[PDB]
Design a protein around this ligand. Structure first.
Ligand SMILES: [Cl-]
Ligand SMILES: [Cl-]
Length: 118
């Protein structure tokens, strides 16, 4: 799987070259980093909010582009929001690692498929 950054921050190897989506990816790294250091109910709900907003915006750009790999991508999105929308603070160590892993793997293994296609 790809390297999990420590400290958990965004870096350039995650760039997709669509400014607003890259800003949103940066905020999801920050959302998870904040949950890790302050595992609170506000921080978890912020992570749910920023991730939902990002997934709606990324899916709106894939649909506008008639990007042909949008439906398995949308299911990936739906499953992750279902997972973190069901969590409650403090998130245990296993689910924190799940989120860390999932965000890295999702950007590089699935969002990278739309590079230059949106
Ligand atoms: Cl890499
Ligand atoms: Cl093309």
């Amino acid at each position: 799987g790809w390297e999990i950054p420590e400290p958990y921050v965004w870096d350039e190897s995650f760039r997709v070259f669509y400014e607003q989506l890259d800003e949103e990816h940066k905020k999801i790294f920050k959302g998870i980093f904040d949950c890790i250091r302050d595992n609170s109910a506000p921080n978890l709900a912020t992570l749910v909010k920023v991730t939902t907003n990002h997934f709606t915006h990324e899916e709106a750009m894939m649909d506008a582009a008639k990007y042909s790999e949008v439906v398995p991508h949308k299911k990936m999105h739906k499953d992750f929001l279902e997972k973190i929308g069901g969590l409650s603070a403090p998130v245990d160590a296993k689910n924190v690692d799940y989120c860390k892993e999932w965000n890295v793997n999702h950007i590089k293994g699935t969002d990278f498929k739309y590079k230059g296609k949106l």
